[PDB]
Design an enzyme around this catalytic site. Structure first.
Site, PDB file in Angstrom:
ATOM      1  N   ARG A 112       0.850  -1.416  -0.073  1.00  0.00           N
ATOM      2  CA  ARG A 112      -0.131   0.094   0.154  1.00  0.00           C
ATOM      3  C   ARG A 112       0.971   1.298  -0.026  1.00  0.00           C
ATOM      4  NH1 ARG A 112      -3.169  -3.700  -1.629  1.00  0.00           N
ATOM      5  NH2 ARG A 112      -5.556  -3.634  -0.711  1.00  0.00           N
ATOM      6  N   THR A 156       3.953   0.739   2.954  1.00  0.00           N
ATOM      7  CA  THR A 156       3.775  -0.619   3.651  1.00  0.00           C
ATOM      8  C   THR A 156       3.715  -1.836   2.852  1.00  0.00           C
ATOM      9  OG1 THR A 156       1.535  -0.351   3.966  1.00  0.00           O
ATOM     10  CG2 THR A 156       2.645   0.741   5.522  1.00  0.00           C
ATOM     11  N   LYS A 205       6.379  -1.945   7.715  1.00  0.00           N
ATOM     12  CA  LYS A 205       6.646  -0.713   6.941  1.00  0.00           C
ATOM     13  C   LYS A 205       7.738  -0.603   5.960  1.00  0.00           C
ATOM     14  CE  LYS A 205       3.334   1.091   9.663  1.00  0.00           C
ATOM     15  NZ  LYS A 205       2.283   0.361  10.027  1.00  0.00           N
ATOM     16  N   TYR A 214       0.131   6.528  10.447  1.00  0.00           N
ATOM     17  CA  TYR A 214      -0.290   5.295   9.743  1.00  0.00           C
ATOM     18  C   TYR A 214      -1.706   5.077  10.168  1.00  0.00           C
ATOM     19  CZ  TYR A 214      -1.195   0.166   9.262  1.00  0.00           C
ATOM     20  OH  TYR A 214      -1.642  -0.696   8.653  1.00  0.00           O
TER      21      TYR A 214
HETATM   22  O1  LIG Z   1      -1.456  -0.698   4.567  1.00  0.00           O
HETATM   23  C1  LIG Z   1      -1.905   0.220   4.709  1.00  0.00           C
HETATM   24  C2  LIG Z   1      -1.163   1.717   4.338  1.00  0.00           C
HETATM   25  C3  LIG Z   1      -1.684   2.741   5.149  1.00  0.00           C
HETATM   26  C4  LIG Z   1      -0.878   4.145   5.148  1.00  0.00           C
HETATM   27  C5  LIG Z   1       0.224   4.126   4.130  1.00  0.00           C
HETATM   28  C6  LIG Z   1       0.965   5.606   4.028  1.00  0.00           C
HETATM   29  C7  LIG Z   1       0.604   6.772   4.568  1.00  0.00           C
HETATM   30  C8  LIG Z   1      -0.894   6.595   5.224  1.00  0.00           C
HETATM   31  C9  LIG Z   1      -1.390   5.553   5.581  1.00  0.00           C
HETATM   32  O2  LIG Z   1      -3.198   3.052   4.576  1.00  0.00           O
HETATM   33  C10 LIG Z   1      -4.007   1.983   4.721  1.00  0.00           C
HETATM   34  C11 LIG Z   1      -5.403   2.171   4.682  1.00  0.00           C
HETATM   35  C12 LIG Z   1      -6.204   0.959   5.101  1.00  0.00           C
HETATM   36  O3  LIG Z   1      -7.587   1.117   5.110  1.00  0.00           O
HETATM   37  C13 LIG Z   1      -5.697  -0.388   4.834  1.00  0.00           C
HETATM   38  C14 LIG Z   1      -4.173  -0.649   4.919  1.00  0.00           C
HETATM   39  C15 LIG Z   1      -3.220   0.560   4.729  1.00  0.00           C
END
Ligand SMILES: O=C1C[C@@H](c2ccccc2)Oc2cc(O)ccc21
EC number: 5.5.1.6
Length: 212
Positions: free
Chosen positions: A33, A45, A94, A103
């Site tokens: 993601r 991540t 991460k 996060y």
């Molecule tokens: O695994 C992730 C990364 C995360 C993320 C990555 C970078 C910056 C902010 C948030 O966002 C998400 C949102 C979600 O509903 C489920 C999983 C993830």
């Protein structure tokens, strides 16, 4: 013949066993993601979704003998994975350093949108999401650090944090709320999760197990 998967040098074992529950899980899929900035995909991540060993017998009834291509286009198939009578274990590692609140902000956003979407976002779910936020405030995820979501079929979501990729001994918090408990996995492989990497992995790997 269940294999492991490596994502950006982060490995996901084919099978694993938890110290908190004592059950064993198999890697159902993995992916990554992040954020799309100026048309560029910026990775933050890696995500691995594990299923309790008993998920096979459960899913076997309805999905045994279907082609990967067939499962991938069937929403009901993913609904059984999300809400099936077995634990799901999600481990997010991460790639880029994120603080607990950095996060969790986006995760909570996607979960709240989903919950409001299906009409299950009352005070209880709001409170549960606040407890969710509260659990992330004291942590920081440098590259390699992980977050473990243990989705119990009993309507509980367990949260764990590890300095690396090894499963922690104790869980940091338990979110006791049915709707919220599956929200997280919903935003990863549910109908309104754009990223198909995780969904595809599930369609490609499951068929093998369902047949034996
Ligand atoms: O695994 C992730 C990364 C995360 C993320 C990555 C970078 C910056 C902010 C948030 O966002 C998400 C949102 C979600 O509903 C489920 C999983 C993830």
């Amino acid at each position: 013949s269940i294999t492991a998967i490596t994502v950006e040098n982060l490995e996901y074992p084919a099978v694993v066993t938890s110290p908190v529950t004592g059950k064993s899980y198999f890697l159902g899929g993995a992916g990554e993601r992040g954020l799309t900035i100026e048309g560029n995909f910026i990775k933050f991540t890696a995500i691995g979704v594990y299923l309790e060993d008993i998920a096979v017998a459960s899913l076997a009834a309805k999905w045994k003998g279907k082609s990967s291509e067939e499962l991938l286009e069937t929403l009901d198939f993913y609904r059984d994975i999300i809400s099936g009578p077995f634990e799901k274990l999600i481990r997010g590692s991460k790639i880029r350093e994120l603080s607990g609140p950095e996060y969790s902000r986006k995760v909570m956003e996607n979960c709240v949108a989903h919950l409001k979407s299906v009409g299950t976002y009352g005070d209880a779910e709001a409170e549960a999401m606040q407890k969710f936020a509260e659990a992330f405030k004291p942590v920081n995820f440098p590259p390699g650090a992980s977050v473990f979501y243990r989705q119990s079929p009993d309507g509980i979501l367990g949260l764990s944090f590890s300095p690396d990729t090894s499963i922690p001994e104790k869980e940091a918090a338990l979110i006791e709320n049915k709707a919220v408990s599956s929200a997280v996995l919903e935003t990863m492989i549910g109908e309104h999760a754009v990223s198909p990497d995780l969904k595809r992995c599930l369609a490609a790997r499951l068929p093998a197990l369902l047949n034996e």
